[PDB]
Design a protein around this ligand. Structure first.
Ligand code: HEC
Ligand code: HEC
Ligand code: HEC
Ligand code: HEC
Length: 107
Protein backbone atom coordinates (compact mmCIF):
# COMPACT_ATOMS: atom_id res chain seq x y z
CA UNK A 1 0.00 0.00 0.00
CA UNK A 2 0.99 3.65 -0.53
CA UNK A 3 1.44 6.32 2.15
CA UNK A 4 -1.11 9.17 1.98
CA UNK A 5 -0.34 12.81 1.35
CA UNK A 6 1.08 15.07 4.02
CA UNK A 7 -1.18 17.21 6.21
CA UNK A 8 -3.24 14.46 7.83
CA UNK A 9 -5.20 15.70 10.88
CA UNK A 10 -5.14 13.49 13.98
CA UNK A 11 -8.18 14.94 15.72
CA UNK A 12 -9.74 12.62 18.30
CA UNK A 13 -8.87 15.13 21.01
CA UNK A 14 -8.76 18.85 21.83
CA UNK A 15 -5.00 18.79 21.08
CA UNK A 16 -4.99 17.79 17.38
CA UNK A 17 -1.74 17.05 15.55
CA UNK A 18 -0.71 17.23 11.88
CA UNK A 19 0.91 14.00 10.70
CA UNK A 20 3.19 13.95 7.64
CA UNK A 21 4.05 10.58 6.14
CA UNK A 22 6.95 12.25 4.25
CA UNK A 23 8.80 12.81 7.57
CA UNK A 24 8.55 9.07 8.30
CA UNK A 25 9.15 7.51 4.85
CA UNK A 26 12.30 5.64 5.89
CA UNK A 27 10.33 3.52 8.38
CA UNK A 28 8.39 0.42 7.38
CA UNK A 29 4.61 0.90 7.31
CA UNK A 30 4.24 -1.88 9.90
CA UNK A 31 6.42 0.06 12.39
CA UNK A 32 3.24 2.04 13.09
CA UNK A 33 0.49 0.21 11.23
CA UNK A 34 1.19 -3.06 13.05
CA UNK A 35 -0.62 -6.14 11.71
CA UNK A 36 -3.71 -7.41 13.53
CA UNK A 37 -4.79 -11.06 13.58
CA UNK A 38 -2.26 -11.81 10.82
CA UNK A 39 -3.71 -9.21 8.46
CA UNK A 40 -2.57 -5.84 7.19
CA UNK A 41 -3.95 -3.06 9.36
CA UNK A 42 -4.23 0.49 8.05
CA UNK A 43 -7.24 1.33 10.24
CA UNK A 44 -7.49 4.51 12.31
CA UNK A 45 -5.76 3.95 15.65
CA UNK A 46 -8.73 4.99 17.82
CA UNK A 47 -11.24 2.72 16.00
CA UNK A 48 -13.75 1.29 18.52
CA UNK A 49 -12.14 -1.73 20.17
CA UNK A 50 -8.61 -0.61 19.31
CA UNK A 51 -6.88 2.36 20.98
CA UNK A 52 -10.24 3.87 21.93
CA UNK A 53 -9.76 4.72 25.62
CA UNK A 54 -9.16 8.43 26.13
CA UNK A 55 -8.50 8.51 29.88
CA UNK A 56 -4.86 9.69 30.11
CA UNK A 57 -4.44 7.60 33.27
CA UNK A 58 -5.29 4.38 31.39
CA UNK A 59 -2.23 2.24 30.75
CA UNK A 60 -3.99 -0.67 29.00
CA UNK A 61 -3.42 -1.69 25.38
CA UNK A 62 -6.58 0.29 24.58
CA UNK A 63 -5.11 3.59 25.77
CA UNK A 64 -4.91 6.16 22.98
CA UNK A 65 -2.77 8.41 25.16
CA UNK A 66 -0.20 5.62 25.76
CA UNK A 67 0.37 4.59 22.13
CA UNK A 68 1.32 8.19 21.36
CA UNK A 69 3.02 9.46 24.51
CA UNK A 70 4.65 6.55 26.40
CA UNK A 71 8.36 7.29 26.80
CA UNK A 72 9.39 3.64 26.53
CA UNK A 73 8.28 1.05 23.98
CA UNK A 74 9.10 -2.62 23.31
CA UNK A 75 6.87 -4.17 20.64
CA UNK A 76 5.65 -1.13 18.72
CA UNK A 77 7.25 2.31 18.99
CA UNK A 78 5.22 5.24 20.22
CA UNK A 79 5.54 8.71 18.70
CA UNK A 80 7.29 9.82 21.87
CA UNK A 81 9.59 6.84 22.33
CA UNK A 82 10.93 7.20 18.81
CA UNK A 83 11.16 10.99 18.94
CA UNK A 84 13.05 10.77 22.28
CA UNK A 85 15.62 8.59 20.52
CA UNK A 86 15.73 10.83 17.43
CA UNK A 87 16.19 14.02 19.46
CA UNK A 88 18.93 12.50 21.60
CA UNK A 89 20.65 15.03 23.81
CA UNK A 90 20.33 18.40 22.01
CA UNK A 91 17.93 21.08 23.26
CA UNK A 92 16.46 22.11 19.89
CA UNK A 93 15.48 18.63 18.70
CA UNK A 94 13.97 17.97 22.15
CA UNK A 95 11.98 21.20 21.82
CA UNK A 96 10.81 20.38 18.27
CA UNK A 97 10.17 16.66 18.59
CA UNK A 98 9.40 15.87 22.23
CA UNK A 99 8.00 18.99 23.90
CA UNK A 100 4.43 19.22 25.22
CA UNK A 101 3.92 22.67 23.76
CA UNK A 102 5.91 24.74 21.23
CA UNK A 103 6.86 21.47 19.55
CA UNK A 104 6.08 20.36 15.99
CA UNK A 105 3.46 17.99 17.41
CA UNK A 106 1.83 20.56 19.70
CA UNK A 107 2.71 24.09 18.46
C1 HEC B 1 4.42 14.04 18.92
C2 HEC B 1 5.46 13.17 18.93
C3 HEC B 1 3.81 14.47 20.28
C4 HEC B 1 4.46 15.01 21.32
C5 HEC B 1 5.96 15.36 21.44
C6 HEC B 1 3.51 15.22 22.37
N1 HEC B 1 2.26 14.83 21.92
FE1 HEC B 1 0.49 15.02 22.85
N2 HEC B 1 -0.54 14.31 21.24
C7 HEC B 1 0.08 13.81 20.11
C8 HEC B 1 -0.90 13.23 19.24
C9 HEC B 1 -0.66 12.54 17.88
C10 HEC B 1 -2.23 13.42 19.94
C11 HEC B 1 -3.61 12.99 19.46
C12 HEC B 1 -4.16 14.04 18.50
C13 HEC B 1 -5.65 13.83 18.33
O1 HEC B 1 -6.43 14.76 18.62
O2 HEC B 1 -6.04 12.71 17.91
C14 HEC B 1 -1.92 14.10 21.17
C15 HEC B 1 -2.86 14.49 22.09
C16 HEC B 1 -2.56 14.96 23.33
C17 HEC B 1 -3.49 15.27 24.39
C18 HEC B 1 -5.03 15.10 24.29
C19 HEC B 1 -5.42 13.78 24.94
C20 HEC B 1 -6.90 13.76 25.25
O3 HEC B 1 -7.48 14.82 25.64
O4 HEC B 1 -7.48 12.65 25.11
C21 HEC B 1 -2.81 15.69 25.45
C22 HEC B 1 -3.38 16.12 26.81
C23 HEC B 1 -1.41 15.69 25.10
N3 HEC B 1 -1.29 15.25 23.80
C24 HEC B 1 -0.40 16.04 25.95
C25 HEC B 1 0.95 15.99 25.69
C26 HEC B 1 1.99 16.15 26.67
C27 HEC B 1 1.70 16.36 28.18
C28 HEC B 1 3.16 16.07 26.02
C29 HEC B 1 4.59 16.12 26.59
C30 HEC B 1 5.00 15.10 27.37
C31 HEC B 1 2.87 15.85 24.61
N4 HEC B 1 1.51 15.80 24.44
C32 HEC B 1 3.80 15.73 23.61
C33 HEC B 1 1.42 13.85 19.82
C34 HEC B 1 2.41 14.36 20.64
C1 HEC C 1 4.53 6.02 11.86
C2 HEC C 1 5.71 6.68 12.01
C3 HEC C 1 3.87 5.73 10.49
C4 HEC C 1 4.44 5.18 9.40
C5 HEC C 1 5.89 4.70 9.22
C6 HEC C 1 3.43 5.10 8.38
N1 HEC C 1 2.25 5.60 8.87
FE1 HEC C 1 0.47 5.68 7.92
N2 HEC C 1 -0.37 6.72 9.44
C7 HEC C 1 0.28 6.92 10.66
C8 HEC C 1 -0.61 7.62 11.53
C9 HEC C 1 -0.32 8.06 12.97
C10 HEC C 1 -1.88 7.85 10.76
C11 HEC C 1 -3.15 8.54 11.29
C12 HEC C 1 -3.98 7.44 11.93
C13 HEC C 1 -5.07 8.03 12.77
O1 HEC C 1 -5.86 7.24 13.33
O2 HEC C 1 -5.17 9.29 12.88
C14 HEC C 1 -1.66 7.25 9.47
C15 HEC C 1 -2.58 7.21 8.45
C16 HEC C 1 -2.45 6.40 7.34
C17 HEC C 1 -3.48 6.15 6.36
C18 HEC C 1 -4.90 6.76 6.36
C19 HEC C 1 -5.83 5.94 7.25
C20 HEC C 1 -7.22 6.50 7.09
O3 HEC C 1 -7.38 7.75 7.11
O4 HEC C 1 -8.17 5.69 6.94
C21 HEC C 1 -2.98 5.30 5.46
C22 HEC C 1 -3.70 4.74 4.20
C23 HEC C 1 -1.62 4.99 5.83
N3 HEC C 1 -1.32 5.70 6.98
C24 HEC C 1 -0.77 4.15 5.15
C25 HEC C 1 0.58 4.03 5.37
C26 HEC C 1 1.51 3.31 4.53
C27 HEC C 1 1.11 2.53 3.25
C28 HEC C 1 2.73 3.46 5.07
C29 HEC C 1 4.07 2.92 4.54
C30 HEC C 1 4.48 3.33 3.31
C31 HEC C 1 2.59 4.26 6.27
N4 HEC C 1 1.28 4.60 6.42
C32 HEC C 1 3.61 4.60 7.12
C33 HEC C 1 1.55 6.56 11.01
C34 HEC C 1 2.48 5.98 10.18
C1 HEC D 1 -7.40 -2.64 16.24
C2 HEC D 1 -7.70 -3.49 15.25
C3 HEC D 1 -6.10 -1.77 16.25
C4 HEC D 1 -5.77 -0.75 15.44
C5 HEC D 1 -6.58 -0.14 14.27
C6 HEC D 1 -4.46 -0.27 15.83
N1 HEC D 1 -4.03 -1.04 16.89
FE1 HEC D 1 -2.29 -0.80 17.90
N2 HEC D 1 -2.67 -2.48 19.00
C7 HEC D 1 -3.83 -3.24 18.90
C8 HEC D 1 -3.67 -4.43 19.68
C9 HEC D 1 -4.69 -5.58 19.87
C10 HEC D 1 -2.28 -4.35 20.30
C11 HEC D 1 -1.64 -5.42 21.23
C12 HEC D 1 -0.26 -5.93 20.81
C13 HEC D 1 -0.06 -6.03 19.32
O1 HEC D 1 0.98 -5.49 18.84
O2 HEC D 1 -0.91 -6.63 18.61
C14 HEC D 1 -1.73 -3.10 19.81
C15 HEC D 1 -0.50 -2.62 20.12
C16 HEC D 1 -0.03 -1.38 19.81
C17 HEC D 1 1.11 -0.76 20.46
C18 HEC D 1 1.94 -1.42 21.59
C19 HEC D 1 1.16 -1.55 22.90
C20 HEC D 1 0.51 -0.25 23.27
O3 HEC D 1 1.24 0.75 23.49
O4 HEC D 1 -0.76 -0.22 23.35
C21 HEC D 1 1.28 0.44 19.89
C22 HEC D 1 2.33 1.52 20.20
C23 HEC D 1 0.26 0.59 18.87
N3 HEC D 1 -0.52 -0.53 18.84
C24 HEC D 1 0.09 1.68 18.06
C25 HEC D 1 -0.87 1.78 17.08
C26 HEC D 1 -0.98 2.85 16.10
C27 HEC D 1 -0.01 4.04 16.00
C28 HEC D 1 -2.04 2.59 15.33
C29 HEC D 1 -2.54 3.42 14.13
C30 HEC D 1 -1.69 3.82 13.14
C31 HEC D 1 -2.65 1.36 15.78
N4 HEC D 1 -1.92 0.91 16.85
C32 HEC D 1 -3.78 0.77 15.24
C33 HEC D 1 -4.95 -2.91 18.16
C34 HEC D 1 -5.00 -1.96 17.17
C1 HEC E 1 10.28 6.41 14.58
C2 HEC E 1 10.00 5.08 14.50
C3 HEC E 1 9.15 7.47 14.61
C4 HEC E 1 7.86 7.28 14.99
C5 HEC E 1 7.15 6.00 15.49
C6 HEC E 1 7.21 8.57 14.87
N1 HEC E 1 8.12 9.50 14.41
FE1 HEC E 1 7.69 11.44 13.98
N2 HEC E 1 9.59 11.71 13.32
C7 HEC E 1 10.62 10.76 13.39
C8 HEC E 1 11.86 11.34 12.96
C9 HEC E 1 13.23 10.64 12.91
C10 HEC E 1 11.52 12.79 12.59
C11 HEC E 1 12.49 13.88 12.05
C12 HEC E 1 12.34 13.96 10.54
C13 HEC E 1 11.89 15.33 10.08
O1 HEC E 1 11.49 15.46 8.88
O2 HEC E 1 11.93 16.31 10.88
C14 HEC E 1 10.10 12.91 12.83
C15 HEC E 1 9.39 14.06 12.61
C16 HEC E 1 8.13 14.33 13.06
C17 HEC E 1 7.51 15.63 13.10
C18 HEC E 1 8.19 16.95 12.64
C19 HEC E 1 8.19 17.04 11.12
C20 HEC E 1 6.78 17.16 10.61
O3 HEC E 1 6.32 16.27 9.86
O4 HEC E 1 6.09 18.15 10.97
C21 HEC E 1 6.29 15.47 13.62
C22 HEC E 1 5.22 16.55 13.87
C23 HEC E 1 6.09 14.06 13.91
N3 HEC E 1 7.25 13.39 13.56
C24 HEC E 1 4.96 13.50 14.47
C25 HEC E 1 4.82 12.18 14.81
C26 HEC E 1 3.64 11.57 15.39
C27 HEC E 1 2.33 12.32 15.74
C28 HEC E 1 3.91 10.26 15.54
C29 HEC E 1 3.00 9.16 16.10
C30 HEC E 1 1.76 9.04 15.58
C31 HEC E 1 5.26 10.01 15.08
N4 HEC E 1 5.78 11.20 14.64
C32 HEC E 1 5.89 8.79 15.12
C33 HEC E 1 10.48 9.46 13.82
C34 HEC E 1 9.32 8.87 14.26
Amino acid sequence: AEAPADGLKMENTKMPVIFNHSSHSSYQCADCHHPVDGKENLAKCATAGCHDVFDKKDKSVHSYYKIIHDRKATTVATCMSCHLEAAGSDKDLKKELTGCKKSKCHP
